[PDB]
Amino acid sequence: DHRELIGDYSKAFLLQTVDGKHQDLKYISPETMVALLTGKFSNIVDKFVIVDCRYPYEYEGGHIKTAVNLPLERDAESFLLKSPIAPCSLDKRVILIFHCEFSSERGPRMCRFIRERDRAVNDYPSLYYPEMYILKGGYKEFFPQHPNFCEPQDYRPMNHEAFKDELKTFRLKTRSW
Ligand code: MMC
Ligand SMILES: [Cl-]
Structure with a gap:
């Protein structure tokens, strides 16, 4: 591999990465997303969590099968860090993929x-989640290309004109603005 090692320096990144706006983050394409969902890496990947960081109305409108909706910092902390998700095998990996509307x-x-x-609660340089990716293009880019991997087969934009009140309500729930 021509890149650096993953978070705890144990090995290299498994997936092929594409270029994205944040230069220090690792981005994957929708194609690689379908590869994991179809079991292409089942020999090596024990578990991969898809974290949709969109507001609840957006997720309900249509999300990628298997994804979990964790819009608030607190919920994410609770789901992922209280009781970490571990591989069933020492050999296998655990991978996290984050995405939003546009990512x-x-x-x-x-x-x-x-x-x-993860850094804060472990002894350097161990991590519960050394390998994390962003799905480049977000749900917006994913839906029109692989609709049968979405449930329901539809797309609700955050700015959806009929969910204006729900957007305001939701923001008043956030740790900070
Ligand atoms: C760094 Hg994610
Ligand atoms: Cl928050």
Whole structure:
């Protein structure tokens, strides 16, 4: 591999990465997303969690099969760090994939946050989650290409004109603005 090692310096990144806006983050394409969902890496990957950082209305409107919705910092901390998700095999890996609508703001921030807490609660340089990726293009790019991997087969934009009140309500739930 021509790149650096993963978070705890144990080995290299498994997946092929593409270029994305945040230069220090690892991005994967929708194609690689379908590869994991179809079991292409089942020999090596024990578990991969898809974290959709969108607001609840957006997720309900249609999300990638198997994804979990964790919009608030607190929920994510609770789901991932209280009782970490471990591989059933010493040999196998655990991988996290974050995404939002455009994978421009929400997703990358959540990725950076979980990394901060993973570092904070372990002895350097161990991590519960050494390998994390962003799905480049977010749900917006994913739906029109692989609709049968989405449930329901539909797409609800955050700015959806009929969910204006729900957006405001939701933001008043956030740790900070
Ligand atoms: C760093 Hg994610
Ligand atoms: Cl929050």
